[PDB]
Write a protein that binds this ligand. Structure first.
Ligand code: HEM
Ligand code: HEM
Ligand SMILES: CC(C)(C)ONC(=N)/N=C/CC[C@H](N)C(=O)O
Ligand SMILES: CC(C)(C)ONC(=N)/N=C/CC[C@H](N)C(=O)O
Ligand SMILES: C[C@H](O)[C@H](O)[C@H]1CNc2nc(N)[nH]c(=O)c2N1
Ligand SMILES: C[C@H](O)[C@H](O)[C@H]1CNc2nc(N)[nH]c(=O)c2N1
Ligand SMILES: [Zn+2]
Lengths: 411, 407
């Protein structure tokens, strides 16, 4: 079966055959579309087919399908599964797998870069202090003094589900949030619960508006331990505006390295529950979502006030005006400090070229429109006008429950 | 089978049960989501009529009453005898209001119960269609105080006597390709404009020419008619702070009136059912003005503002976009023509969704269409999970009649 997608701006039609290789479910049926829903211990039984599927994919990628080397590796993995009930990936397969999980990540607009990912193998790690050291190294390598380099660090895979490696932080670098007794929040409201955990674990909080959170790291199913990332390793950018000189007096800054640390990487049926990965920011992530969501720093009012916009009626589009100015400031600030950032026009234009390339060479590109379209100026970006098909390919990044909801405390 | 939708800004969770009555299919499967794709007999008819009459009698609290049974009996008799049936006025009005209520792509549905339904099932000629349409235009326009309306022409019979309005909206601007290679007027309408010219329209060959109506009665060849200019309320576009903005010479029409969809009620198909409400500002200022394949005016506006257009990261497009949209709203408001901004409309839709969840058990909604085409995440609909499913009565797409019609 072939499926066609059309761009309604250009009339370019593309044909998808890659969706035939999709195995996992979407959440949708013939009777309900769940496309806007945010979120819609294995036996040998299920493990060998998943491993075989993966190694067939790997050996095809390297022009070695059906080779002696291919056959010997299936045999070796099969015996390892029946003998030990799991298996170990070769380094080459781990690299291939991690790059493909990114290539397959349908919510990711940055995937033109997928083949340039630095994979750090941390599968020899055994303790939280060991995890801390690997994570400092990733941050320093990825940051590269502002010339950001995409990277992933991969800790040991799940075994019995009782010995999991987890990074409890949702990102390696994030700011603390504090709920005040009057009901207001200081800092980032998204991180209040996590910040309360850290404090309970013994972090002494500076209690300001941009406190970089400590790492909370669980090795081998043990209780997590706290570590402060060396401040000299945390690159930050003070936010100012090219024309408005009062903008700096808002006291805003943000960190340069966006590093997702709470997802699960699945490769060939193996589950890597700690696999922090990092790229670089698209400006709207900070300027639209982190600053202007009502449930985040919520700075629209204060900015619009300073601009003396007409705030008595929404139809003045005061929020829209302030929104654009904030986003100019974020891009200006990062570019001026020589910290890698991409604007939403450049990023979406690149994605469309990536997507067309993938259709030609791969037969498809799964993509989640809801996530790919930027949270401001949607229809003046080419992706708004592009029909996409969303389906799930493995290797993949997957959500997993927050570890505080499932952890068995040792004491 | 019982489904939750969460708002991520407010944490409010709603439970959807209404989807279980979903009839038509979505295009999606368990393997693939098609959420962003724009267009994914006697024995057939009786269950459809029954399903509809059942929800109708339920709505007037008369389910299982004799009057309910008797109507079902009568229609069954009528289908058996005539192969079709005729809706009572009460059913027709209920059906059209509900087709709007069920429109998953419509952010304006808080208004769904206030719909003036004009029964045109007695219409027989293109001239009668023109008459009904002028009356709808004048009624809905109401000197700028717009009122929602639908006009319903006769239902499909054997399918070779279809009533159709060939136009995609009652009021739109012409488009002409030039020797230049550029396009004058609205490029969306270039093809329909050619069809009009080939049918005999003398086009005045300008940027904002109101197109003539091309009306097909009774499967006959369609015919041209000019809407009385005095019935077409238009708005010149100026800006509350930029004096040069009026120099661009932009205008738009006050009445958005979709005229190419098919209304399905109780299995009956109404192939000509033009309907109208009023504009949300972004439809004109973001889509009609700034789409690359529409009037595409961002470049000209940015220049006049003297923005740095050397690099995408200055956000010059985004800046001009906001200004264009301020100017659309200001202009309609100044001229006392109903318009709604995207903040107000989306806020209303959230309130409507809650009402529907509470009173009906859900609200089919298509997030891809509901979230405005600018400033998505600063509107509350961005953060609201929505379930998309197909309920009937419904408005459906149908093929353009020039691809179907036999001359
Ligand atoms: C290279 C620079 C990159 C840019 C500009 C980029 C851009 C983005 C953006 C804007 C989102 C949506 C984020 C949000 O709204 O929270 C995203 C999601 C995602 N990206 Fe990329 N990305 C990049 C690199 C990567 C890398 C290196 C990986 C993994 C190796 C990755 C995997 C994903 C995944 C798994 C998601 C979905 C996360 C979720 O569901 O919350 N990205 N990316
Ligand atoms: C009262 C004022 C109304 C407002 C502000 C409103 C708002 C909108 C908006 C912004 C769209 C998306 C249009 C587009 O992007 O092309 C839409 C689509 C839709 N609306 Fe409403 N609407 C209103 C009245 C109505 C009425 C009176 C009906 C039917 C009786 C209706 C049925 C629909 C349908 C069927 C669509 C989807 C059409 C398509 O797929 O192209 N609307 N509406
Ligand atoms: C971590 C990752 C995906 C590799 O980098 N990509 C990226 N630009 N952003 C991902 C999430 C960042 C999040 N939106 C934030 O604003 O902190
Ligand atoms: C009833 C009706 C016609 C849907 O009104 N709704 C509306 N505000 N617009 C719908 C389509 C109009 C189209 N987006 C336009 O910008 O011309
Ligand atoms: C409910 C809805 O799916 C949710 O708000 C999504 C919308 N699209 C998004 N897109 C991106 N990139 N990131 C997000 O957090 C979201 N949030
Ligand atoms: C490809 C994509 O589905 C298409 O561009 C849609 C996106 N969302 C939309 N939303 C509305 N309200 N109107 C539209 O025309 C579209 N176009
Ligand atoms: Zn779907």
């Amino acid at each position: 079966r072939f499926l066609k997608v059309k761009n309604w701006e250009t009339d370019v039609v593309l044909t998808d055959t890659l969706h035939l290789k999709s195995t996992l479910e979407t959440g949708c049926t013939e009777h309900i579309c769940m496309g806007s829903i945010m979120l819609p211990v294995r036996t040998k039984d299920q493990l060998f087919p998943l491993a075989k599927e993966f190694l067939d994919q790997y050996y095809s990628s390297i022009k070695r399908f059906g080779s002696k080397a291919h056959m010997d590796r299936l045999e070796e993995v099969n015996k390892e599964i029946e003998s030990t009930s799991t298996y170990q990936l070769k380094d080459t397969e781990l690299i291939y797998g991690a790059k493909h999980a990114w290539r397959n990540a349908s919510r990711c607009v940055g995937r033109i870069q997928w083949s340039k990912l630095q994979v750090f193998d941390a599968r020899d790690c055994t303790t939280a202090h060991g995890m801390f050291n690997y994570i400092c190294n990733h941050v320093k390598y990825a940051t590269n003094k502002g010339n950001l380099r995409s990277a992933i660090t991969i800790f040991p895979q799940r075994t019995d589900g009782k010995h999991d490696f987890r990074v409890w932080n949702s990102q390696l670098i994030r700011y603390a949030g504090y709920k005040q007794p009057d009901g207001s929040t200081l800092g980032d409201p998204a991180n209040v619960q996590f910040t309360e955990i850290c404090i309970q674990q013994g972090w002494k909080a500076p209690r300001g508006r941009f406190d970089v959170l400590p790492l909370l790291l669980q090795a081998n199913g043990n209780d997590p331990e706290l570590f402060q990332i060396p401040p000299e390793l945390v690159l930050e950018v003070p936010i100012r505006h090219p024309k408005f000189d009062w903008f700096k007096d808002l006291g805003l800054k943000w960190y340069g390295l966006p590093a997702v640390s709470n997802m699960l990487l699945e490769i060939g049926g193996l589950e890597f529950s700690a696999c922090p990965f990092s790229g670089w920011y698209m400006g709207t992530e900070i300027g639209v979502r982190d600053y202007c969501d009502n449930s985040r720093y919520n700075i629209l009012e204060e900015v619009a006030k300073k601009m003396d916009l007409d705030m008595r009626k929404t139809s003045s589009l005061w929020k829209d005006q302030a929104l654009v100015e904030i986003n100019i400031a974020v891009l200006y600030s990062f570019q001026s400090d020589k910290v890698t950032i991409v604007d939403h026009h450049s990023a979406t234009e690149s994605f469309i070229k990536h997507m067309e390339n993938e259709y030609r060479c791969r037969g498809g590109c799964p993509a989640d429109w809801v996530w790919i379209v930027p949270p401001m100026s949607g229809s003046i970006t080419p992706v708004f006008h592009q029909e996409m098909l969303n389906y799930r390919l493995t290797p993949s990044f997957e959500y997993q429950p927050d570890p505080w909801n499932t952890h068995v405390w040792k004491g």
